[PDB]
Amino acid sequence: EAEAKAKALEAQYRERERAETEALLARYRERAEAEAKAVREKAMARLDEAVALVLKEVLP
Amino acid sequence: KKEYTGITYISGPLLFVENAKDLAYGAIVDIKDGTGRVRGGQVIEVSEEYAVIQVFEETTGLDLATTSVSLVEDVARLGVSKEMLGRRFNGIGKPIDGLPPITPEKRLPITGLPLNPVARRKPEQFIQTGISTIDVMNTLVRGQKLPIFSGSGLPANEIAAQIARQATVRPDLSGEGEKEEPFAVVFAAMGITQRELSYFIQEFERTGALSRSVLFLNKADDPTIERILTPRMALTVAEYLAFEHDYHVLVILTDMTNYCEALREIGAAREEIPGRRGYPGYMYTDLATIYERAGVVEGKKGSVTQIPILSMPDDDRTHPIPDLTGYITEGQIQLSRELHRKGIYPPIDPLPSLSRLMNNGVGKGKTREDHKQVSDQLYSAYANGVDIRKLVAIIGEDALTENDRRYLQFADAFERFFINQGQQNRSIEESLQIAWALLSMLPQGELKRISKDHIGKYY
Amino acid sequence: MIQGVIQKIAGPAVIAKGMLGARMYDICKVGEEGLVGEIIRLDGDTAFVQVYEDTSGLKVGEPVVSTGLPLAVELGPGMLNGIYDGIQRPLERIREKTGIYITRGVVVHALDREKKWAWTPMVKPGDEVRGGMVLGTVPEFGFTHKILVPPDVRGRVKEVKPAGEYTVEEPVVVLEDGTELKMYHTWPVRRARPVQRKLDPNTPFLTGMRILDVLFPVAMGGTAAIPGPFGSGKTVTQQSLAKWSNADVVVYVGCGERGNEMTDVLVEFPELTDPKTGGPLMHRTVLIANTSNMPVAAREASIYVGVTIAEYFRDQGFSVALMADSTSRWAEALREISSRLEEMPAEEGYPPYLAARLAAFYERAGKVITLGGEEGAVTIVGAVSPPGGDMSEPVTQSTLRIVGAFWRLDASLAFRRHFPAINWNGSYSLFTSALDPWYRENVAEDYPELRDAISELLQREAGLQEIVQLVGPDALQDAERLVIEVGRIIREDFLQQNAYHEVDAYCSMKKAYGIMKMILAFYKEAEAAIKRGVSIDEILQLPVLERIGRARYVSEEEFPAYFEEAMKEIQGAFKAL
Amino acid sequence: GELLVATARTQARGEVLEEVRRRVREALEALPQKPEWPEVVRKLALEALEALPGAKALVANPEDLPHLEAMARERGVELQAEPRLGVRAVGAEGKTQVENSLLARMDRAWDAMSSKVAQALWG
Numbered sequence A: 001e002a003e004a005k006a007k008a009l010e011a012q013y014r015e016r017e018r019a020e021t022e023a024l025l026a027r028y029r030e031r032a033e034a035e036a037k038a039v040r041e042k043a044m045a046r047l048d049e050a051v052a053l054v055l056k057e058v059l060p
Numbered sequence B: 001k002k003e004y005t006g007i008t009y010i011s012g013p014l015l016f017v018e019n020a021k022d023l024a025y026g027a028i029v030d031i032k033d034g035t036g037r038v039r040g041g042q043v044i045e046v047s048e049e050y051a052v053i054q055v056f057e058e059t060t061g062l063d064l065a066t067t068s069v070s071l072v073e074d075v076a077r078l079g080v081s082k083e084m085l086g087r088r089f090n091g092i093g094k095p096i097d098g099l100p101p102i103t104p105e106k107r108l109p110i111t112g113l114p115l116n117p118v119a120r121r122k123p124e125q126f127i128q129t130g131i132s133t134i135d136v137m138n139t140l141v142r143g144q145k146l147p148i149f150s151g152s153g154l155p156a157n158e159i160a161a162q163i164a165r166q167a168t169v170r171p172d173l174s175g176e177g178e179k180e181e182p183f184a185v186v187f188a189a190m191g192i193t194q195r196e197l198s199y200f201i202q203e204f205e206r207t208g209a210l211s212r213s214v215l216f217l218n219k220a221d222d223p224t225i226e227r228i229l230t231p232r233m234a235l236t237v238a239e240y241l242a243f244e245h246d247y248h249v250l251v252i253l254t255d256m257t258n259y260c261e262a263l264r265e266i267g268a269a270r271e272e273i274p275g276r277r278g279y280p281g282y283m284y285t286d287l288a289t290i291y292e293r294a295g296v297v298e299g300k301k302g303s304v305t306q307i308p309i310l311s312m313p314d315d316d317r318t319h320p321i322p323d324l325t326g327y328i329t330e331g332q333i334q335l336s337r338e339l340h341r342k343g344i345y346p347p348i349d350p351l352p353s354l355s356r357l358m359n360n361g362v363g364k365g366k367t368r369e370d371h372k373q374v375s376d377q378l379y380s381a382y383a384n385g386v387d388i389r390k391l392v393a394i395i396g397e398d399a400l401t402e403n404d405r406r407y408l409q410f411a412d413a414f415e416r417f418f419i420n421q422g423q424q425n426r427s428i429e430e431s432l433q434i435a436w437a438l439l440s441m442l443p444q445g446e447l448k449r450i451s452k453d454h455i456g457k458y459y
Numbered sequence C: 001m002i003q004g005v006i007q008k009i010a011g012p013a014v015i016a017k018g019m020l021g022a023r024m025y026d027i028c029k030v031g032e033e034g035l036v037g038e039i040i041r042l043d044g045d046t047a048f049v050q051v052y053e054d055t056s057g058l059k060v061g062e063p064v065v066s067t068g069l070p071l072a073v074e075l076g077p078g079m080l081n082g083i084y085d086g087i088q089r090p091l092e093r094i095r096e097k098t099g100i101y102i103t104r105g106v107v108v109h110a111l112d113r114e115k116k117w118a119w120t121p122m123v124k125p126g127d128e129v130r131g132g133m134v135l136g137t138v139p140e141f142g143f144t145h146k147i148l149v150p151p152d153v154r155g156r157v158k159e160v161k162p163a164g165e166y167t168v169e170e171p172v173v174v175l176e177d178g179t180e181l182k183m184y185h186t187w188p189v190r191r192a193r194p195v196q197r198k199l200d201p202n203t204p205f206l207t208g209m210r211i212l213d214v215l216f217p218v219a220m221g222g223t224a225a226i227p228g229p230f231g232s233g234k235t236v237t238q239q240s241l242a243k244w245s246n247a248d249v250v251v252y253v254g255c256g257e258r259g260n261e262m263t264d265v266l267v268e269f270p271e272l273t274d275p276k277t278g279g280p281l282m283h284r285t286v287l288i289a290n291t292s293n294m295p296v297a298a299r300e301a302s303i304y305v306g307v308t309i310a311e312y313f314r315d316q317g318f319s320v321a322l323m324a325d326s327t328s329r330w331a332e333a334l335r336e337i338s339s340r341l342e343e344m345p346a347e348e349g350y351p352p353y354l355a356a357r358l359a360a361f362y363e364r365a366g367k368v369i370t371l372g373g374e375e376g377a378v379t380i381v382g383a384v385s386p387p388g389g390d391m392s393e394p395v396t397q398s399t400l401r402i403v404g405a406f407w408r409l410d411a412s413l414a415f416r417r418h419f420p421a422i423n424w425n426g427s428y429s430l431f432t433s434a435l436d437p438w439y440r441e442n443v444a445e446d447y448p449e450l451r452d453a454i455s456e457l458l459q460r461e462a463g464l465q466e467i468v469q470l471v472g473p474d475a476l477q478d479a480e481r482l483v484i485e486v487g488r489i490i491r492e493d494f495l496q497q498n499a500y501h502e503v504d505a506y507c508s509m510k511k512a513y514g515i516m517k518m519i520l521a522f523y524k525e526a527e528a529a530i531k532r533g534v535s536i537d538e539i540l541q542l543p544v545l546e547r548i549g550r551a552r553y554v555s556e557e558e559f560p561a562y563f564e565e566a567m568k569e570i571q572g573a574f575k576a577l
Numbered sequence D: 001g002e003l004l005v006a007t008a009r010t011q012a013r014g015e016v017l018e019e020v021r022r023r024v025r026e027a028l029e030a031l032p033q034k035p036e037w038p039e040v041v042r043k044l045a046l047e048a049l050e051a052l053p054g055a056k057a058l059v060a061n062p063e064d065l066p067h068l069e070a071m072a073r074e075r076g077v078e079l080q081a082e083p084r085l086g087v088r089a090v091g092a093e094g095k096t097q098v099e100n101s102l103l104a105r106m107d108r109a110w111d112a113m114s115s116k117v118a119q120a121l122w123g
């Protein structure tokens, strides 16, 4: 019956791991998606200027 | 931009073209085909009249009508950034994952300039590597040059990897730990088999310390020549992480045997009289310039640790390559072929493994000062033994007298117990302990190399 | 092409002038013999040709031209049971047209252009493919031969002719991109087809030879060397290996060998009968043979052909055998070309290219996964020949680097005739830390200890022998003399084997595991037995050892018949002791 | 998870850099039809000839030939073929044949100012 006890312990260990590893993804992936987006948005504004700058240099 | 045409000789990775005038000895140029695809190019010998280009590819289908060169830069420099970790690169240095070409922060030359001795600060910390062998006797000081001598078909790589996962500072003997330090590594090989490759990778992801690392990979199948480019490329990634980013990077070299192979080729195929046993003489330099980079500077939180590993054939330490390496380098730890097939892992043992940096403030002071002299005992202790490995096989089962019996008795013992470690980790103390326990079977009054207190202290 | 002619001649080499804008390494038809050379050096208007066709009485002024293309194989079916020599040319035809010799300068196609084949298109017009996918199958022997699309060739499909009897000649599938894909295609040998990704080892590769596999097996990818002086098996064990497999096709090189050296090899093959198809084993074999009176340099060409075949078939799902006969040849080859281009050779006289290319030769093989998601693995097992007869030449010694495991052989065993002559205190393996999955899957877990438990024996055999001859077995006791005839059995029924025996011709894990328990017993029983005041003399005389001495005889079917039979006799006869 | 986060970000920045590149490409391709196209001609024409210490003759699109009068006076004149955005030339002998493509100028500056743009960009 002690072999039973440990066997059952394993269950809990695999479960807790499972559920959480799945959860860790949720938070991370949607934060990845969120920040990735947030750098696009960050960029937009002065994007233009770079082209202006670069163009001015290469030209002659 | 520039633009050079006028081939004259192609044959082996040596090229010739005239009308140079402002080309630079050692310059990355290009090789536009006719097919349309570029190839590399080093200026390994400008001249008044012609010069040598150093094809980093092979040549194939190449002609005398569309072979067109273009000086890209005078010298090889490269960008780098912190953010690029976990990515792959190769001898050229293009990324391999498929993600963006890096955005450099600062470009820096690759050949570098060497250190200034005044700027260097003496080593003084060491880490627990998890194998006694080192960790008792030789003491892997931080930022050291350690070559690990091996042969083919021995466990060269594995053992290296172990170190990578057990490498860690000791806060205990200080007041400063990994609560004051993170940890990191940069790995490259220079071509290897495939079998070594993947095997490697699976130990970085399962540690997961991959992220905080850099990989350069040349696989043993690319154009040979880029064997001599690659080391340095990575090596400059060391200072950079060391000095402005500040780090604790272990840098690992393996397949250096093959370094020189290729090296030789340009060496002699172009010309130079061989500078000894089928190799050029500036081999020395070329293997100075690699190894020499390590160490630490005053007041910096970097650490340039070089750990090379390679294999010469047989076990002749006198075979060219490890040869000079020896002088150059510092450390010296050997696998022991003999032990291998008698199942003891890692087979590393002192038979000529002879450290270097040890006395300088580690394994003592901060560490127990019943260590140093321990080691030294054990050293001769082993000596005394193994002498008789022959004398035994000469006299008969035994004719030796009783005392000396103990010698042989602890030998055989020692090797078996002490030197065999499973995927174990033995703390410096858990290690040490054993040591006195092996000193046990020798009665006192033969151990004459450690003070009277210490000897009984831990008997 | 390009025109130009000769400049000076030096044996296999010739230089040529006036050629310009010529490509690097090519099909170079030279002379009116038309010799296919190769541009190694390209210097100015001056081209080094480099034949693979034996020279004789050329002059200066004969036409020299070149395709501007390297060197590649006509691909398709019809490959198995073919001849192709090293320069691809098929001896079949040659044999016929040229009487009884080999005569340079005779040119023919490689793969036949007259043979008919049923065609099953597995494609329809307007469809879209990718480079390396299959377009259709063709019935070849017990094989799903397929037409794999060439590299960087893809797109829409214009048409697909339906079924029919054809020569490889016609395009059955012309692309809707205006691309007439004929069956065979051109893939230059000095390069390798890539693969989608590479699959990795964990699956044993058996040639089934007992000791060979059991002590130091290799995996199905992997790489290994064979070296030793002339005499121990090298030259002919490989032949034998062919006669069994854990693989499909069998692709056999041979270089610098003499005709008699491969005679039987050819003619016997139809009598060989593979059991994994039941076929007559010549149907999956390839003759790439080379004489020994060809140019030195044609022993280069020759090698490269094999491996480049291997991938093609391998991408067709298959397990490929490459068994490289003697790298020494190849060596010498380059060693000769050297003279020509006048380069300061590295020590022991070789070009320092040396293991450059060698290195790659080993890499290319292995288990992989294709674009087609097919499997197949290339196994390679290379042989070497240093003059002294051991590691003592770089050309062998450095060969030991870029490789997996190796299969040592030595003279001494060859004298007392133990085929093979593996020094079992020689070689290593480098997969036995990863072949255990399949082990305890087919044998069962009690293999992963017990095998090792044989090793200990011979480990300890060594350590005593030394003293045995230093004094005598006499001043040693029972337990000492124990292992002496343990070891004995480990030779009697392993090391000593034949490849002539109708019985030991093929052997297997059952017989393995089989004797692996047999011996175990004697040990375990005797260990207690001689401590029963018993003398080992007597234990030597116990006929049941003598019974196991017939171990190499039970034809492997009724093998557990005799297993279990004598099993009892052990626990029987010894219950006296 | 962290690795996905890193990739994502770097990937995204790639979207940025590529656009900035695209705009340059678009811009550079719009320079002929900006009235400053004759103006631009000799900048680069003089520039290449200056870089070639030899001299022989220049070669270009007949389009831009007119804009150049300077080295229609000087040089040997052999203003031919097309270098088309860029100007080409060859100095004495076959030799080196140094040119100046505008698009090669992007690639030159790119290799430099890969770094600078990122500073300007993310901020």
Ligand SMILES: Nc1ncnc2c1ncn2[C@@H]1O[C@H](COP(=O)(O)OP(=O)(O)O)[C@@H](O)[C@H]1O
Pocket (backbone or CB within 6 Å): C229, C230, C231, C232, C233, C234, C235, C236, C237, C414, C417, C418, C419, C420, C421, C499
């Ligand atoms: N596996 C074996 N080991 C040793 N000798 C063998 C073995 N099998 C056969 N022989 C005998 O030795 C001969 C030559 O062995 P090998 O080394 O292959 O050839 P050679 O030295 O004649 O080129 C075989 O043809 C046969 O007569």
